[PDB]
Amino acid sequence: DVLKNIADTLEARREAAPQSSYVASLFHKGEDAILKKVAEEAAETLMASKDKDKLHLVREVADLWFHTMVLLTYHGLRPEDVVMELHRREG
Amino acid sequence: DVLKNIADTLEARREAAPQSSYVASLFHKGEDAILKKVAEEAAETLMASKDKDKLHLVREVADLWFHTMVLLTYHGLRPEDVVMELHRREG
Amino acid sequence: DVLKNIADTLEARREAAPQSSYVASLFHKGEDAILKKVAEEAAETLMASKDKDKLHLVREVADLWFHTMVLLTYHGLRPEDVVMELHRREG
Amino acid sequence: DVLKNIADTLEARREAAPQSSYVASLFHKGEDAILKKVAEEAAETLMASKDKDKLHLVREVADLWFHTMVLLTYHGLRPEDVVMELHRREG
């Protein structure tokens, strides 16, 4: 769909050059560097929600999902897993 | 797709009975109660990643996205916004 | 001082009965259960700060430090370590 | 004791030059910039605990408490409040 393409792009540059891209620099830095970002975006999501800044909220929630996908890719998993897991629950 | 249906389901019971469902109890409790859960799942995502528990990771990341969607719905927004925001960036 | 006494109390019931106390139940539950709480109080601290609820802020920051101390105790460490580490930096 | 001195130092440079110190730059940046740090150190505390890196754990928990104090100072409060609040509970 859209996430699949992003996932494929992530896996593509999974083991690319550290300077190649941002996603590449993350993967090279490691698990911690990725988790930092996840936590960061999660906190910003809270802040955004509190400030009723609906535009910032969406940007952060997106940045959160994105880094979450970067994390999944680091663990040899991918979006669909999460989507299917979501499906398995509700509905 | 799958998220759209979940979103529609969330909006449906947005102002339902507090005892109707879990999602309903959350909405009734408020913003804070929703944010607690978002933060919770974010933390668990970190723990899961560290423990290399790939199955727990996916379950949590999904619970995170789910509550993130609950948050969006609380603010009169929805998944597609995040998906399109994701598209606007990468690609 | 005050933290020392709390620390001593924590270490005291470190390996007590699971039903003995709350602190005891935590230790029995494990590392994760303790980290959940640390993250929870951290999030609430953010929320409280945002809502300018100065009384709730102090209650949460305290709950945070407390669980942080429970964490340290779980790792065979203690408050003074943190205090001294704080001293070593500023001043 | 030790925290009191740090608190006093924080309040001292509360409204100092943005370039004066790190604590000064934070206060100038705002509430959000301080909350970012609190969340950051909280997440690092989780990571450290998981990696059993006991030395990093104490360094982070201390950085956490420190930024928590910076937060308190930003809200015209101070350490003793948290310490007393801690006392009021246990013991």
Full DSSP string of A11-61: HHTTTS-TTT-HHHHHHHH-HHHHHHHHHHHHHHHHHHHHTT-HHHHHHHH
Q: Do residues C7 and C68 make contact, with C-beta atoms less than 8 angstroms apart?
A: no
Please give the resolution of this entry in Å, rounded to 1 decimal: 2.8
Query: Which residue of C31, C32, C38 to mutate against B (max B Cβ within 10 Å)?
Result: C32
**B69 vs B67: CA distance, rounded Å:** 5
Please indicate the experimental technique that yielded this structure: X-ray
* Matching residue, tokens 């102002």: B15
- Report the greatest alpha carbon distance in chain A: 43
How many C-alpha atoms does C23 have within 13 Å on its Cβ side?
A: 23
Q: Do residues A68 and B45 make contact, with C-beta atoms less than 8 angstroms apart?
A: yes
* Stretch (H or E) spanning D66: helix D54-74
**A22 vs A27: CA distance, rounded Å:** 9
C-alpha R_g of chain B: 14
**A16 vs A22: CA distance, rounded Å:** 11
Q: Which residues of A touch D39 (CB under 8 A)?
A: 39-40, 42-43
Q: How far is CA D6 from CA A57, D29, D72, D85, in A?
A: 35, 20, 12, 19
**D37 vs C57: CA distance, rounded Å:** 16
DSSP for B57-86, written as a single string:
HHHHHHHHHHHHHHHHHHTT--HHHHHHHH
Q: Is A43 close to C47, i.e. CB distance below 8 A?
A: no
Tokens of D4: 């009191």
Fold for A1-91, please state it: Helix Hairpins (1.10.287)
What's the angle, vertex CA A40, arms to CA C50 and CA B34, rounded to 5? 55
The dihedrals phi and psi of C70, each to the nearest 5 degrees, come to -65, -40
Of C34, C57, C86, the CB nearest to D65: C86
Tokens of D35: 């909350």
Q: Which of A85, A82, A59, A88 is nearest to A3 (CA)?
A: A82
- Residue type for position B34: I
**D45 vs C34: CA distance, rounded Å:** 11
Q: Which of C39, C25, C28, C29 is nearest to C67 (CA)?
A: C39
Q: Do residues B50 and D50 make contact, with C-beta atoms less than 8 angstroms apart?
A: yes
Q: Which residues of A touch B77 (CB under 8 A)?
A: 54, 57-58
The dihedrals phi and psi of D17, each to the nearest 5 degrees, come to -75, 140
Q: Which residues of C touch A47 (CB under 8 A)?
A: 46, 50
3-state secondary structure chain C: CCHHHHHHHHHHCCCCCCCCCHHHHHHHHCHHHHHHHHHHHHHHHHHHHHCCCHHHHHHHHHHHHHHHHHHHHHCCCCHHHHHHHHHHHCC
**C67 vs A87: CA distance, rounded Å:** 36
Of C64, C72, C86, the CB nearest to D66: C86
C-alpha R_g of chain C: 14
Of B39, B44, B47, the CB nearest to C43: B39
Q: Do residues C54 and D47 make contact, with C-beta atoms less than 8 angstroms apart?
A: no
How many C-alpha atoms does B71 have within 13 Å on its Cβ side?
A: 32
Q: Do residues C86 and D65 make contact, with C-beta atoms less than 8 angstroms apart?
A: yes
C-alpha R_g of chain D: 14
